[PDB]
């Protein structure tokens, strides 16, 4: 029997700062126990200061990104070159995903950018279109490895102030872009060690009011 789905592996990570946002993802593409590519971009600049990544089944991921990029283009044509806000993009993607409720895009999607007040924003989707605005989200193969680490090191979960003994929590101080990128790199270094589908390279897209910037880092190739 023909199986229309497949698993191309990979892992993605989005973190929302106070006035910035990052969307990171490894560059390894795989089937079963083989490597297809050590550098196959997964996170894309979709225009209007929005970045997007559809992790899971690459063919469905490439199709969704392609269609959203297309949706941005037609939004400009139809509405006088208006800028597509991150919240509007999120809702638009929900309807793209649910168009296939009965033949889903097998992808875990994350977009990142800035809201209309200039603050950092990350939105996370499931394969059938449910979404929500989030501060921190890892998706894909090593999602379960990374998310707990981010609950601990971004939202300071289970962390309290010494001397008080569980009475007073650790205050939720904001993180800088330099601090976030450290947590991203450590997250992918740790994920590469314990997950076979993660490795080769790390590509990070950072979003600010000044635009979209890229950073690349090598990962272990075994």
């Amino acid at each position: 029997q023909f199986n229309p789905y497949g698993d191309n592996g990979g892992t993605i990570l989005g973190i929302a700062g106070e006035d910035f946002a990052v969307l990171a993802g490894d560059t390894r593409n795989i089937t079963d126990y083989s490597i297809n590519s050590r550098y196959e971009p997964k996170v894309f600049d979709c225009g209007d200061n929005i970045v997007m990544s559809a992790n899971g089944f690459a063919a469905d991921g490439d199709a969704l990104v392609k269609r959203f990029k297309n949706s941005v283009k037609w939004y400009h044509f139809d509405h006088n070159d208006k800028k597509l806000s991150i919240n509007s993009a999120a809702r638009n993607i929900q309807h793209l995903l649910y168009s296939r409720r009965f033949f889903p895009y097998y992808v875990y999607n994350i977009i990142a950018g800035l809201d209309e007040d200039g603050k950092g924003a990350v939105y996370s989707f499931d394969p059938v279109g449910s979404y929500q605005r989030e501060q921190c989200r890892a998706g894909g193969a090593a999602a379960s490895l990374i998310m707990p680490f981010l609950d601990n090191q971004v939202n300071f979960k289970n962390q309290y102030e010494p001397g008080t003994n569980g009475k007073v929590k650790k205050p939720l101080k904001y993180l800088s872009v330099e601090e976030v990128i450290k947590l991203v790199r450590d997250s992918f270094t740790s994920a590469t060690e314990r997950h076979i589908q993660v490795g080769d390279g790390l590509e990070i897209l950072i979003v600010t009011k000044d635009g979209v910037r890229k950073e690349f880092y090598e990962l272990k190739r075994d």
Partner: protein
């Protein structure tokens, strides 16, 4: 999830938890399981997340259009039926959605249970999701029509807590809503971790658990 909703003297209470699961993995600690359809209509969510969001946000489209055409706010009875009719089109297709449509209209407060089979039930009290059995236990023994808003808000809050504790697939946080004839009122996000210890001390309950 666990969701509940009940009618009483001063309107209707609506309370939900905030967890989302992917098998054993807790995919989301804080999801919003209530949709604000309009200033006088609420919708709870249980089942497939995408189905709940898509169809209730589509219900809100249809409820808005009703107001524009008729120049009058839609009833809770009519709104609940529009939703149930949508479910009957995709009858047998595999949708998974269990929800309460809460609101205040001309007949007073209104509460309807709607599910994927097209079921539509009017009633004073409902609870849906994997942890509803736990919520019903607290509700059934403490519910009166003569409740004060303060006590009613606490009852629904406490009923979710009960379920969040025992049910593995319920927890994270509690979202409270109070529906009046001047509209619904949000009564905040309440972390279960902090709420549990608070309730344990003040109420004296959960003696079995060590704190």
């Amino acid at each position: 999830t666990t969701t509940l909703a009940f009618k009483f003297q001063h309107g209707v209470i609506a309370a939900v938890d905030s967890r989302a699961s992917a098998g054993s993995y807790i995919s989301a600690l804080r999801v919003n399981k209530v949709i604000e359809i309009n200033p006088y209509l609420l919708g709870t969510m249980s089942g497939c997340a995408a189905d709940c969001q898509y169809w209730e946000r589509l219900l809100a489209k249809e409820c808005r259009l009703y107001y524009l055409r008729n120049g009058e706010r839609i009833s809770v009875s009519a709104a609940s039926k529009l939703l149930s009719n949508m479910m009957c089109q995709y009858r047998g297709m595999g949708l998974s959605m269990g929800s309460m449509i809460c609101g205040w209209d001309k007949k007073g407060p209104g509460l309807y249970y709607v599910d994927e089979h097209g079921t539509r039930l009017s009633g004073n009290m409902f609870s849906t999701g994997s942890g509803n059995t736990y919520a019903y236990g607290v509700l059934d023994s403490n519910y009166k029509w003569d409740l004060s808003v303060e006590d009613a808000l606490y009852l629904g809050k406490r009923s979710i807590l009960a379920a969040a504790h025992r049910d593995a697939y319920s927890g994270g946080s509690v979202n409270l809503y109070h529906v009046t004839e001047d509209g619904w009122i949000y009564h905040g996000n309440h972390d279960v971790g902090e709420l549990f210890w608070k309730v344990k001390e003040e109420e004296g309950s959960f003696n079995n658990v060590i704190g």
